[PDB]
Amino acid sequence: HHWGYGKHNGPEHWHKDFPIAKGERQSPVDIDTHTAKYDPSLKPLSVSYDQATSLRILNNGHAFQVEFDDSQDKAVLKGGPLDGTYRLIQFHFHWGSLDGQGSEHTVDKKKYAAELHLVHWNTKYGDFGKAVQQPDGLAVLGIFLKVGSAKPGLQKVVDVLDSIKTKGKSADFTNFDPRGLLPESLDYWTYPGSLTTPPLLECVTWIVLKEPISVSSEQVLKFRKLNFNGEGEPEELMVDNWRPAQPLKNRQIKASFK
Ligand SMILES: [Zn+2]
């Protein structure tokens, strides 16, 4: 009976195995655009993905994860609110059963159809496992998805999903360029928070882009064909794998833009 997104093991149950679920800097949160304060001190966000090297894509029973070779100084996030350099290790999505829900962060209570998370670790801590034990261990770039025009750069991801339908399936996924998943503008909101999946560690600087990307209905429909279950188990569609907004508590959301 491990954690998931169902009635008996979903977000409202997580605190039992992971007490930090009720902690002081949990994610995601609602972004109140009128309360977020422009911070002229923020530096421009630097996203350097030109040398990114993808390895594999995996269905882990909670989402699908595209993993990168992070053994060299390549796909790096820096600047913005960050001190130092963070290296890309993986990205994944959260999405809904319907276009009207799916995102984890919300904007003035608005839910997007999905949300992309590009996860980077602080190189000062040597590797991901050590980084997540530190308050400034991770930087996650969050990008909202809305349904409209197709995102051509997402299609390579969508076409491989048939091969990793069920929990535990993985496939080679080389030469995928995550630059194809970025919106035009890098305007962002930033706040200190957590992983949004167990173990929910409070180790993330969140950087959430204001501009969503558009994906087509057909593209998101293919996300919804994935399965939470493993091969040979009763089919339960992988949908609504999002944690809802958590209390902001003692935190300020800063905006990079006015
Ligand atoms: Zn995530």
105 is in an annotated binding site: no
List the structure tokens of 202.
């409070």
Residue 250 CA to ligand 1 centre (angstroms): 22
85 is in an annotated binding site: no
Residues whose CB is less than 8 angstroms from the CB of residue 52 and which lie 6 or more positions away in sequence, other chains included: 68, 74, 75, 88, 176, 177, 178, 179
Residue 125 CA to ligand 1 centre (angstroms): 21
Pairing verdict, β 76-79 and 85-95: antiparallel
SS3 152: helix
Residues whose CB is less than 8 angstroms from the CB of residue 39 and which lie 6 or more positions away in sequence, other chains included: 254, 255, 256
Other Cβ atoms within 10 Å of 7 Cβ, number: 8
92 is in an annotated binding site: yes
List the structure tokens of 250.
């003692």
Question: Which element (helix H / strand E) includes 77?
Answer: strand 76-79
Cβ pair 195, 27 in contact under 8 A: yes
Kindly state the DSSP code that residue 73 receives in the 8-state scheme: S
Cβ pair 240, 100 in contact under 8 A: no
CA distance 82 to 85: 8
Catalytic residue, candidates 15, 62, 105, 120: 62
Kindly state the DSSP code that residue 225 receives in the 8-state scheme: T
To what resolution in angstroms was this structure determined? Answer: 1.5
CA distance 202 to 246: 13
Residue 117 CA to ligand 1 centre (angstroms): 5
Phi (first) and psi of residue 252, to 5 degrees = -115, 135
Cβ pair 106, 114 in contact under 8 A: no
SS3 21: helix
Question: Which element (helix H / strand E) includes 157?
Answer: helix 155-160
CA distance 93 to 164: 15
8 is in an annotated binding site: no
Give the residues after which the backbone of the chain is interrupted, taking a C-to-next-N distance over 2.5 angstroms as a break: none
2 a catalytic residue? no
Residue 63 CA to ligand 1 centre (angstroms): 9
Q: Which CATH number fits domain 1-258: 3.10.200.10, 3.40.50.150, 3.40.50.300, 3.40.50.410?
A: 3.10.200.10
Residues whose CB is less than 8 angstroms from the CB of residue 254 and which lie 6 or more positions away in sequence, other chains included: 36, 37, 38, 39, 42, 81, 189, 190, 191
**Residues β-bridged to residue 57:** 66, 171
Report domain extents, the chain.
Answer: 1-258
